[PDB]
Amino acid sequence: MIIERLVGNLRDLNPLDFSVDYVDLEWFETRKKIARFKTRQGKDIAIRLKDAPKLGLSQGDILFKEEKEIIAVNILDSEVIHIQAKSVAEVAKICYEIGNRHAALYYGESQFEFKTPFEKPTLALLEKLGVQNRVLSSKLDSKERLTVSM
Amino acid sequence: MIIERLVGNLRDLNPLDFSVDYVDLEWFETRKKIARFKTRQGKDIAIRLKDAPKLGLSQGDILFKEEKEIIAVNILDSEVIHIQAKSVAEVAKICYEIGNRHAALYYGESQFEFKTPFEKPTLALLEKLGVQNRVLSSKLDSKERLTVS
Ligand SMILES: [Cl-]
């Protein structure tokens, strides 16, 4: 089946009212408009999206919704550097240095927290700046991404 | 003789018996240790700075101080984009986008204000981000500069 339009996002509804099948996406594939998947329940599903969200596909974005069945997007965990800034000035320094390296950056759960894909030089940079950071397996959700130019 | 050492800053001086001649620098000429200038009064000077401030010369830095004559730095006012963030999330976006373009960035007067030299590309980019911005004539003082690494 080939889907051409998203139908919103699981946060807009009560998911327990529905059987939710997922398609698994890598964080770095979320900006694809044309792709094919096998859902976790083995359904053949493709996308050829006319107008995708500019941030890319987010967690819970709904590809298909009929009666009580949903096919929704899950973004796969990846190795992630989590950043804990301690001041507004630090937030500025960090984002500026990370932008200079052109590394992807995402907002974290709090206004002083950020996430970036694990890369050795990124790690080195933060350690160099003396910024508190953690390496974990986590989701890089498109809707949290800081835009390259948008 | 070649000026090899800074002699402090006007902020810390006692001026009663000191007339000041200025060297007028552009914001982009403050970082180099080696340079020559002509003072506002027409004096030729050359520097080759031993233990230069990391960020560069700043407003009021004293290059020469003898007889009772001082030569000190004035950074010329230039066309500057002033950015006023309204949230921490807005600071992060601003600084990340400017960083991405490798444009110069300076701390403003408050934790949410930031300055960058005016360039059309940077202004277009800030307008699209939807952040409060305006261009004024101001000084980009080296000590407010954010650095790379
Ligand atoms: Cl001036």
UniProtKB/Swiss-Prot annotation, chain B:
Keywords in alphabetical order: Chaperone, Cytoplasm, Nickel, Nickel insertion, Virulence
Keyword Cytoplasm: yes
Cellular component aspect of the GO annotation: cytoplasm
Pfam families on file: UreE_C (PF05194), UreE_N (PF02814)
Gene Ontology biological-process entries: protein folding; protein-containing complex assembly; urea metabolic process
Source organism, top-level taxon: Bacteria
InterPro entries with a match to the protein in the record: UreE, UreE_C_dom, UreE_N, UreE_N_sf
SUPFAM superfamilies: Urease metallochaperone UreE, C-terminal domain, Urease metallochaperone UreE, N-terminal domain
SMART domains: UreE_N
Disulfide topology: none
One example GO MF annotation: nickel cation binding
Subcellular location: Cytoplasm
Main function: Involved in urease metallocenter assembly. Binds nickel. Probably functions as a nickel donor during metallocenter assembly.
Family from the record: Belongs to the UreE family.
Protein name per UniProt: Urease accessory protein UreE
Lineage of source species: Bacteria, Pseudomonadati, Campylobacterota, Epsilonproteobacteria, Campylobacterales
